[PDB]
Amino acid sequence: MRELARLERPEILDQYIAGQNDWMEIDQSAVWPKLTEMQGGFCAYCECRLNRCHIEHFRPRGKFPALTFIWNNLFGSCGDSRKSGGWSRCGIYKDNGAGAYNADDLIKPDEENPDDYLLFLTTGEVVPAIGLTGRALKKAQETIRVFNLNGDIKLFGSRRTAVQAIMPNVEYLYTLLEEFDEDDWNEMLRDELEKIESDEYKTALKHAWT
């Protein structure tokens, strides 16, 4: 889960008004170019490469009908509702699979940096970060539970494999901390960290590298 940088609000949300208008009315191909600029063709929550994808209301339309055409509330999530059932992470699982949840107790990735809450183990679990109690522990635990960031085997395995592929390199780089001077070695680490923005599960790969 990455810290996201929301910037500019699209024209089409100004036209439609919450209460009177329905969500199905809007042209969704208008919305995606701004989300794709923000998120980079990757999911908000799990950081898979988007191929089957839908617009996700962070606070849902059922519970919160006032929050409908609001630019804060939209995110590009993995999986498609229309195509098929049995998608079991992220936006679809938030609604159906995770029944009862406090919408307050979830990490909104545009507002908050998730790196304070979530730690990514090289074994490919995601866990509460070292030293959290009370509310920050509760937010870490519920984000993991509701978006199903361990329970989806397709996700868990795909993340575990991605990290384990680079672990020869991470081992090898830090052995050459001895021989190289700082300006060479820091250029090497910055280059790697540059490459993994274009890669999938980038937060998991960062925690391996840094």
């Binding site: 098929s84 183990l121 074994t123 085997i153 395995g157 081992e171 830090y174 840094t210």
Partner: protein
């Protein structure tokens, strides 16, 4: 043609998997197509490496008494030449080096 795992009989079409299976590793097919963990989740020993890593990260990368005990358990159970022990060794080496860098800074 694969059925969805949580099909309650109302699936209209059987579909192809997303991953190419021909020439792929069996462990990948287990997880990505058959929806089964490559390591048995109902065995405690299957979690030891994860737990070991968490302990190492809690103690700024140094083997404390608790991490050493678990290391010895991993060694005793899986063996000196096991892939699991090699992973543990790797974790120690990497985390020690990361911590040394942090101290220099």
């Amino acid at each position: 043609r694969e059925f969805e795992p949580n099909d309650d009989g109302d699936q209209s079409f059987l579909d192809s998997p997303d991953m190419q299976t021909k020439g792929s590793e069996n462990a990948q097919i287990l997880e990505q197509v058959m929806n089964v963990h490559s390591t048995p989740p109902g065995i405690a020993e299957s979690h030891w490496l994860g737990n070991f890593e968490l302990l190492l990260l809690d103690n700024s990368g140094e083997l404390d008494n608790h991490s050493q005990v678990l290391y010895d358990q991993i060694k005793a159970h899986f063996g000196i030449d096991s892939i699991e022990l090699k992973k543990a060794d790797s974790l120690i080496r990497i985390n020690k080096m990361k911590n040394k860098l942090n101290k220099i800074r």
